[PDB]
Design a protein around this ligand. Sequence first.
Ligand SMILES: NC(=O)C1=CN([C@@H]2O[C@H](COP(=O)(O)OP(=O)(O)OC[C@H]3O[C@@H](n4cnc5c(N)ncnc54)[C@H](OP(=O)(O)O)[C@@H]3O)[C@@H](O)[C@H]2O)C=CC1
Ligand SMILES: NC(=O)C1=CN([C@@H]2O[C@H](COP(=O)(O)OP(=O)(O)OC[C@H]3O[C@@H](n4cnc5c(N)ncnc54)[C@H](OP(=O)(O)O)[C@@H]3O)[C@@H](O)[C@H]2O)C=CC1
Ligand SMILES: NC(=O)C1=CN([C@@H]2O[C@H](COP(=O)(O)OP(=O)(O)OC[C@H]3O[C@@H](n4cnc5c(N)ncnc54)[C@H](OP(=O)(O)O)[C@@H]3O)[C@@H](O)[C@H]2O)C=CC1
Ligand SMILES: NC(=O)C1=CN([C@@H]2O[C@H](COP(=O)(O)OP(=O)(O)OC[C@H]3O[C@@H](n4cnc5c(N)ncnc54)[C@H](OP(=O)(O)O)[C@@H]3O)[C@@H](O)[C@H]2O)C=CC1
Ligand SMILES: Cc1cccc2sc3[nH+]ncn3c12
Ligand SMILES: Cc1cccc2sc3[nH+]ncn3c12
Ligand SMILES: Cc1cccc2sc3[nH+]ncn3c12
Ligand SMILES: Cc1cccc2sc3[nH+]ncn3c12
Lengths: 270, 270, 270, 270
Amino acid sequence: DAIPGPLGPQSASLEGKVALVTGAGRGIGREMAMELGRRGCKVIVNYANSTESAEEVVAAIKKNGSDAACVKANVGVVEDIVRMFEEAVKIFGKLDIVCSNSGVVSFGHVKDVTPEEFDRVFTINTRGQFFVAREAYKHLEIGGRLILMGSITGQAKAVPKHAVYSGSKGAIETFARCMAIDMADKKITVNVVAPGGIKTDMYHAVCREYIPNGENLSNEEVDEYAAVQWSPLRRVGLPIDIARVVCFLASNDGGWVTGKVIGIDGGACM
Amino acid sequence: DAIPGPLGPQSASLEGKVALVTGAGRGIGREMAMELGRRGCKVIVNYANSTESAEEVVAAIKKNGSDAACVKANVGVVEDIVRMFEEAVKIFGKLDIVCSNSGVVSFGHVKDVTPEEFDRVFTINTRGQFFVAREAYKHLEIGGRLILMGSITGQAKAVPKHAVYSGSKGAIETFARCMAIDMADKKITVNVVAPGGIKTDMYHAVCREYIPNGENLSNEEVDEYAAVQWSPLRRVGLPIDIARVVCFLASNDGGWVTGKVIGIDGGACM
Amino acid sequence: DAIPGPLGPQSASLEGKVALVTGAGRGIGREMAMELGRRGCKVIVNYANSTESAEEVVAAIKKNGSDAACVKANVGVVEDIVRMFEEAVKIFGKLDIVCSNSGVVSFGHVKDVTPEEFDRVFTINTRGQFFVAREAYKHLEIGGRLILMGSITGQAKAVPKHAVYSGSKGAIETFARCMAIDMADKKITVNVVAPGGIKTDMYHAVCREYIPNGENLSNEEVDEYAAVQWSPLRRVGLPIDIARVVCFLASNDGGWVTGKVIGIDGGACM
Amino acid sequence: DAIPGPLGPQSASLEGKVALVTGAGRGIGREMAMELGRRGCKVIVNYANSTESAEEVVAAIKKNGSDAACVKANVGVVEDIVRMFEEAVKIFGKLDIVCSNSGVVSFGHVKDVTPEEFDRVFTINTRGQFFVAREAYKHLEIGGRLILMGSITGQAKAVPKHAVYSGSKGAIETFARCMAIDMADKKITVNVVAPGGIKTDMYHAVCREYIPNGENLSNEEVDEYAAVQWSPLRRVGLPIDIARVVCFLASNDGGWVTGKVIGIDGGACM
Ligand SMILES: NC(=O)C1=CN([C@@H]2O[C@H](COP(=O)(O)OP(=O)(O)OC[C@H]3O[C@@H](n4cnc5c(N)ncnc54)[C@H](OP(=O)(O)O)[C@@H]3O)[C@@H](O)[C@H]2O)C=CC1
Ligand SMILES: NC(=O)C1=CN([C@@H]2O[C@H](COP(=O)(O)OP(=O)(O)OC[C@H]3O[C@@H](n4cnc5c(N)ncnc54)[C@H](OP(=O)(O)O)[C@@H]3O)[C@@H](O)[C@H]2O)C=CC1
Ligand SMILES: NC(=O)C1=CN([C@@H]2O[C@H](COP(=O)(O)OP(=O)(O)OC[C@H]3O[C@@H](n4cnc5c(N)ncnc54)[C@H](OP(=O)(O)O)[C@@H]3O)[C@@H](O)[C@H]2O)C=CC1
Ligand SMILES: NC(=O)C1=CN([C@@H]2O[C@H](COP(=O)(O)OP(=O)(O)OC[C@H]3O[C@@H](n4cnc5c(N)ncnc54)[C@H](OP(=O)(O)O)[C@@H]3O)[C@@H](O)[C@H]2O)C=CC1
Ligand SMILES: Cc1cccc2sc3[nH+]ncn3c12
Ligand SMILES: Cc1cccc2sc3[nH+]ncn3c12
Ligand SMILES: Cc1cccc2sc3[nH+]ncn3c12
Ligand SMILES: Cc1cccc2sc3[nH+]ncn3c12
């Protein structure tokens, strides 16, 4: 049968692809846009509040040799998502890759979860991603790429006071399986990246909630724990670790990988 | 170490246990309450609309030798759930087992899902179960049992136009893992039963949506397909098939089974 | 459709069933035969070396009110398995349940595994179980039950120096999926129980190999670790914990549970 | 923290890496060596019987601009594996990547499996891979890559008469989890690629055994079935599909992916 795409290194090229990354002003998302751009991608950085950071990222991508632009939209508002895509398409003309990154964390024993906090998390983490995914489908080029952001907590077995957040990410893994069927009519592949503890603002904010008796841990102590307890490779994961895998899925190399959950932890067990 | 519970058949006894089953007026739930009662349980049948059916079930359980009562509550309304448990506890004095059964189906290509239909399904299937689970925790006896209703679609790989429903059930499997940690402080075990196509009203309504080119299938033809394509055991699953496993988890036998997903299909592959 | 089996507690009855348990002279297996007998089963206890213990168990089952007999066979020798079943059938006339329990542990960094030690473990743990399963098929009554012994290590993510043993148990989970299809022509259900640290001779021998820096731990200290680190339920698992689940699968209640892996840990994460 | 490796496309470069691929004279393996070479790798093609094909591949890689050499060894013989690595290291001086590809298929109802045919498959598929993995550890450069060959059958739910082969591949997934811990002391990442039906000699030989009533299917009919039934993407998988993912895992991009099973099917459900 016919070979799908070029043979050799040329199959990993993202040059000439237009990508949209939600929540790209900081954290993993910022690095996702940065790296995508470094591999020759035109990046559209979406943001909700971090305008400054957003703009800063856009400047950076250009400085690196790629074109970029930023769009504002609150993924928790379906109308904002609908608008974000209508503008996105006009900016560079087409849309090849979509990275649904935006998300929020939450901690608390089941007995203390309020309907307000449950809806807060699920609305961004689960509902937002579905509608971003829905719009991505409509605007993606035939053969496009949809990448959903999940988490190690979707399958973790030992994280206490973490049902709401874990459930929101767990549902994303199921979305991938089902969306991979529907979206295949446009040759779009759908996959879920499931990171496991990356140094970002979030990490700084809630890492201690994962460490048994960690209220006291100093920043370096947290990293020491993370590095040793969570990976045989003995090191803390960085956004670039996710960004690299995301580029693989987005390239020709990931053409036969669809409906899957790629766990990107250093071999962690949570 | 000390043996947990009696040795012998006495370990499967549900006699003297009070159970609450949501959506017990029909389908799998009705049979869940019926069977639980047959094993000596006092059943509280919850219902949303099927009052007649509800009452009918209560009469049946008594006729079989057990006490029962019914409570009305819409699981999509947190206040209703809160009330349902406050009344439940007063009826028979205590609450040992809770079976979160209620749920709704949905079909449609991703591109046609509306925010209204997404919220419709997630609100009952996922959000409702969380709050039923939350209240169950607060009112369950030390050593109680919480059983969540999932589905084969949470892990299925070939069902098209089924992302919303599949995602709502998928999140339930994650809830089980996390809730099993928090709720363990009261010795409560949390598990998810994941049926795979049971003859109920739902089955009559949407089975054809699972069968490639099944609009034409006659009722008997659907059952023939179900029996042959979905199980090496060559037969259609019945509510009693789930009801029996639910009794196992609810008994002393299921004391060391927690945080798990029990797939109850005839060895189906979807 | 027709209801499969009796409604009510009578569905959990094992009375009048003949079962064969391999490696039933001690550990989990001994308790499996004991409990099966307590629920009205005629047990055939197989053994390899523990004759004394074997006979002792047979005396016990009778003293409890059930008939039993013991057969000697080395599961690592296919001819022994073939013979064991030919004799087994003649003893009580038929064979309803088979519990493939026998197994051996092993520890060591990959770099130190010798072909001899690899074959030692795989020959009993994997190859033995396949041939026990093969013979069980041929001799089981239509509607019989085949239960394979697996382990938490089949899916564990953090146990070092444990590839050979973990791999032997992992393959058992796959055997269950496939055997459930072939063996279904005789209505036999095939399932895998996956315990997670049970107090038996094995536990006494190698538990410390699972505890980071545990050479020094005293017996009570090991149990303290096991109870706290491996279960939210805060207690060490006992053979009776597995024995109870095995009876469920062997009864009418487990009729619709086939091709599955039932994890029997206190919600452990390894 | 410090960024692991270069930022940008340079992270996907395999230039200057020495790789060893077992069973590289034909099928997926041949393409694995070819592609690895195209990305600037020095490939050592191992073979068992296909000398001609082996040599042909070596000529090809050189013609493409990379150096290659071939080594003969029967993975079912531990002494051969030990020798293969001692020679391998001397050829190009070092060893960065190892791809354990070699394998054999088998079909048959459980009841017809003979100890000879069970050992035949397990000895190459499971035992061989363990010892190849063991030797890879000893000779791999710090930061090396070990990639094990698995299959969709390790998790498949509907393939009949396939327990022996499925079990041999299933154990490989467990090996990955455990080996990822031990081998991490040398910064080596261990992962399992799990293809799902690739056009190779094997495919030509046994594809019909997967298709219900396929004895009659013509070659083109088989491909039609494969393309439609096994993938929403509607096409048959090719060796290049696996080869591309293998290059990702072998590069810097796969540095944080370890202890995982990458399913490389077109979203197949078996
Ligand atoms: N950090 C970690 O350890 C891991 C993170 N993840 C997931 O990866 C993703 C990113 O995490 P990380 O970078 O650490 O997070 P950060 O806390 O650093 O915040 C990342 C971003 O998400 C955005 N976001 C939040 N709400 C919205 C919204 N309403 N609309 C659009 N964007 C929004 C933020 O936008 P703005 O700032 O502009 O409001 C921001 O850009 C999340 O989905 C997270 O759950 C998964 C596993 C691990
Ligand atoms: N049938 C099947 O093949 C399978 C079913 N399931 C799950 O099992 C559960 C029961 O399914 P099944 O019996 O077939 O369903 P049915 O369609 O027969 O309806 C079952 C019940 O769910 C209830 N329900 C719906 N909304 C509410 C609500 N707002 N509050 C309280 N109860 C409500 C109904 O209550 P009322 O009628 O009183 O409004 C009813 O009692 C569901 O969660 C379903 O998703 C999972 C796998 C397979
Ligand atoms: N203990 C634990 O923590 C867990 C155990 N398991 C599995 O459960 C099973 C039983 O474990 P456990 O009771 O702890 O083990 P023990 O170490 O207590 O030994 C149990 C038995 O296995 C038998 N056995 C060994 N070789 C043979 C053989 N060649 N033929 C027949 N029988 C043989 C022994 O027979 P004899 O003494 O007569 O030679 C004995 O009867 C094993 O498969 C084990 O891997 C799984 C998870 C956890
Ligand atoms: N084809 C498919 O659909 C899929 C294949 N796989 C796996 O991928 C791998 C390759 O499959 P594929 O290329 O299709 O297979 P082929 O039938 O085309 O044969 C591939 C190779 O395996 C080799 N091999 C067999 N025995 C030995 C041995 N004793 N020592 C060294 N090498 C040996 C052959 O060597 P020689 O010819 O030199 O003897 C050959 O080089 C296998 O492990 C297979 O199980 C997994 C999923 C799907
Ligand atoms: C923020 C964080 C820190 C450490 C480990 C994890 S695992 C996960 N999943 N989402 C966030 N996280 C974290
Ligand atoms: C209603 C139904 C029919 C057939 C197969 C399935 S699998 C599933 N999950 N929820 C509902 N169903 C069905
Ligand atoms: C023998 C043992 C002790 C503690 C934990 C485990 S987990 C497992 N699997 N087989 C044996 N074991 C053990
Ligand atoms: C050889 C083959 C053909 C079709 C589908 C599969 S799935 C698998 N796993 N190993 C081999 N195969 C095949």
